[PDB]
Amino acid sequence: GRIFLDHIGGTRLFSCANCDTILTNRSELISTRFTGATGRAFLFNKVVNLQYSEVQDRVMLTGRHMVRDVSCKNCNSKLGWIYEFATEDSQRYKEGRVILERALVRESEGFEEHVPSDN
Amino acid sequence: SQSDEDVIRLIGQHLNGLGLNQTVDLLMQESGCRLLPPSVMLPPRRLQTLLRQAVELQRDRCLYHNTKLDNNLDSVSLLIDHVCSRRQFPCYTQQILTEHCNEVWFCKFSNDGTKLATGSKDTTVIIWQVDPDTHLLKLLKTLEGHAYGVSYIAWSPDDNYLVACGPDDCSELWLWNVQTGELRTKMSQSHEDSLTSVAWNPDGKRFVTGGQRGQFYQCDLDGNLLDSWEGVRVQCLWCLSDGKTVLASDTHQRIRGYNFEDLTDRNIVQEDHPIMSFTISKNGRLALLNVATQGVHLWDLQDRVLVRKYQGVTQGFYTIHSCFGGHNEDFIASGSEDHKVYIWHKRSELPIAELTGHTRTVNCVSWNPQIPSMMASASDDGTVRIWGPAP
Amino acid sequence: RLSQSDEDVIRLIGQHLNGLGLNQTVDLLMQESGCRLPSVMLPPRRLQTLLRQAVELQRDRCLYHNTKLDSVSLLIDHVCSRRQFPCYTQQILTEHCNEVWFCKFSNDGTKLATGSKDTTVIIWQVDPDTHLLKLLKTLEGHAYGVSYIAWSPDDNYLVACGPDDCSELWLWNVQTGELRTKMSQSHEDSLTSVAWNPDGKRFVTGGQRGQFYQCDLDGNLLDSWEGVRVQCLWCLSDGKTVLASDTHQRIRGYNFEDLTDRNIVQEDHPIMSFTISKNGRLALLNVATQGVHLWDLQDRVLVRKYQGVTQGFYTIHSCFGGHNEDFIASGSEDHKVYIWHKRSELPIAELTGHTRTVNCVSWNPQIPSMMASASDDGTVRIWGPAP
Ligand SMILES: [Zn+2]
Ligand SMILES: [Zn+2]
Ligand SMILES: [Zn+2]
């Protein structure tokens, strides 16, 4: 059937680099000092129309975590991962956030939303 | 006893109102009873109230109820309990149309139940004529030329033209002349557009189209652009019967109304979850909504309140459409992702029927506007099933 | 001119009078109405069925209908009064020294267990006739206080947990008031929830640090799960599934035997606590900074949102109750007890009498007129019908 695609709105939008379906915007950004597999990676707050696979435990630069792989809802291409559990207490601020690889997303300019007249 | 005395007194009071007096006098003379404490004086018209309550309870449990004669308190037989005839309920498949060579995406009727339009992923639209004396569907003509498939079909008020759209990121739409079977205009403004929703003006000479990239146009028959709006990512559109009001649902979970003549906008609905599709009733008073990861909702367009929430349907990954239907619009029909069709009555939230027989997803469901015993369901396996009364 | 509707009622009245034990006025009525024998043989006892249907309709609309046959007067509509609904304080229990954090009735509604902020759990026995509560047992040794209490399915054992960052739990037997094994796995654990197994021989415990265990009566560890920070637990009736609410604002079902997990509820605000109806189909849950929400687990759909309770940060517990679980009771931070009927989102009562915040409310399962309320002022209130 026709896959339902959401929209988050705003300015400075991010999109999947393969099919150009929006994922998030600049507003929901936390830290850009992250490293993935293809280079630098970004940590966001909320990402729309993603997919999730299964819980896997692995060792990273800061302790041991359990994560899930994420992928585009329209083209089925891997974009990053999402945290579920973090063993190190200090590393709990990223418990439910999403990392996307900067080489797999594209930035675009989106117009400001028309502000309702509240009528 | 005492319950017998109450019945005797109430029967006497009721009989005294039908012009009988000797019978009442002899009944009060042989039983021994007699007619603001209830012993001092009896309430007025109590037996009639009890009988009306009994008839109302009989109507409440009527499963397939018809509400046309719900305003007539009298004129219902008391000798036998009331039950409607489900003989005309469409709960048995009787025809399987399999001529699309790919998965089917949309189905619609022709505003009078004479023709049925089907649109599928194999880049074609098929029209089926309905035989009036048999209720049998036969192919009439095929319309080809689409590229990415057909996802939304809109009928003209006089059923002389129709408009076919495409899926996401399709920047053109087709307008077909249905009498001669030829193409009139294929409209496209810019290569970066996206037109996924279309609706017709009640006068049948203009139509409003829109998409999720910020495009919201009102156009003529020849494809000429007439009006434009900026700053809205529309998903579903509908034109009100006054001729100068367009209801549009956006990505902020709103169903706001707009006026192109004087450039005005209002606030109507506000949902807690994303909205896929909606349809308004015949008199433009109620709205039926398909909500992501939730059920099917009903809203009042004047009081601006939620009326009921219907459960049992699964959705959220695919786009699914529903419809009003039945005699005087008493039933609600919808598809789902679990390979079956759900039917609800307006009086209850739980489903009445769960019709199975499809092997893959059910995307759209269409009721016949003028034949209340005809439904069509298009599935995600290449089939269109026609449902009618059981044998 | 008597129309068709009149004739049917006339024949019904004639049949009823003839069958009642009278034989004169029926003949006199026929001799004047002039109509008598489907129009051949009337159904037997039509008026009785019609009047019973009317009485059933009258009973359907009754609001404060907590009640558990031609005994109803036909001259006036039937209404259950509010003074019979439990809305008036009947007992004030003042035996705890510091505070009260949790109160719970037994599964057969014979005893009440209240856990205080100081080191005490108190058991009250309910008289069956006069419905009065009397202390019978006191249990001591909970160094950090008691915040959660769970009853065995046959009301022979109860498990009492502590507050946050407490690495122990206690297991008593009610019959003799003695102490079974005091379970403690790791010195740096935190156990704050517990749920029993319908066979009554195993339980499941968990905590915020990431502990999720299934253990036996002797205290041994049978199973453990890693990667979840549970907040509230409940074992289903089938004896395999455990429903747990996590810190990701969702409820998930877990299967220890096959080691599987699925999703059921996804919300947008923290879930402080939840409870599940008797048939295991509906979940009533408390949402932080919002009201009380009802969820259908089989269909996974939010049904109703009840408004009126203030709850910002603290944990507040609500409950089902009524004649057939048609009523919802809850506490709130504004010193009041709230009661709703399932058909509307507006409260049908707003009780009062507590000095400080109320944080536990319970309904008697076997006596649908007794409510227990526990608050931070050091007293417990037993609510019943008006005198
Ligand atoms: Zn993609
Ligand atoms: Zn009916
Ligand atoms: Zn009652």
Numbering used by the authors:
A (entry chain Y): 2 to 120
B (entry chain W): 121 to 155, 274 to 629
C (entry chain 7): 119 to 155, 276 to 306, 311 to 629
How is this structure described in the published paper?
Here, we discover that human WDR26 binds the metabolic enzyme NMNAT1 and mediates its CTLH E3-dependent ubiquitylation independently of canonical GID/CTLH E3-family substrate receptors. Cryo-EM structures of NMNAT1- and YPEL5-bound WDR26-CTLH E3 assemblies reveal an internal basic degron motif of NMNAT1 essential for targeting by WDR26-CTLH E3, and degron mimicry by YPEL5’s N-terminus antagonizing substrate targeting. Cryo-EM structures reveal that WDR26 acts as a non-interchangeable substrate receptor for NMNAT1. Within the supramolecular WDR26-CTLH E3 assembly, the WD40-repeat β-propeller domains from two WDR26 dimers are exposed and provide multiple binding surfaces for NMNAT1.
Cryo-EM maps revealed how YPEL5 inhibits substrate targeting: there is structural overlap between YPEL5 and NMNAT1 binding sites on WDR26-CTLH. Molecular details of YPEL5 binding to WDR26 were revealed by a 3.2-Å-resolution focused refined map. Our structural analysis revealed multivalent binding of a single YPEL5 to both WDR26 β-propeller domains in a WDR26 dimer. YPEL5’s N-terminus presents a sequence that mimics NMNAT1’s internal basic motif that together with YPEL5’s C-terminus captures one WDR26 protomer. Meanwhile, YPEL5’s globular domain binds the adjacent WDR26 protomer. As such, YPEL5 modulates WDR26’s accessibility to degrons from bona fide substrates. From YPEL5, the N-amino group of G2 (exposed upon cleavage of initiator M1) and the side chains of R3 and F5 are anchored through a similar constellation of electrostatic and hydrophobic contacts as the γ-amino group of K126 side chain, R127 and W129 from NMNAT1basic. Comparing the NMNAT1basic and YPEL5 N-terminal sequences reveals a consensus G/K-R-X-ϕ basic motif (ϕ represents amino acids with a bulky hydrophobic residue including W, Y, F) that might be selectively recognized by WDR26. Whereas YPEL5-HA efficiently co-precipitate WDR26, binding to WDR26 was completely abolished in the absence of YPEL5’s N-terminus. Taken together, we propose that YPEL5 inhibits WDR26’s substrate receptor function by mimicking internal basic substrate degrons, thereby preventing substrate ubiquitin targeting.
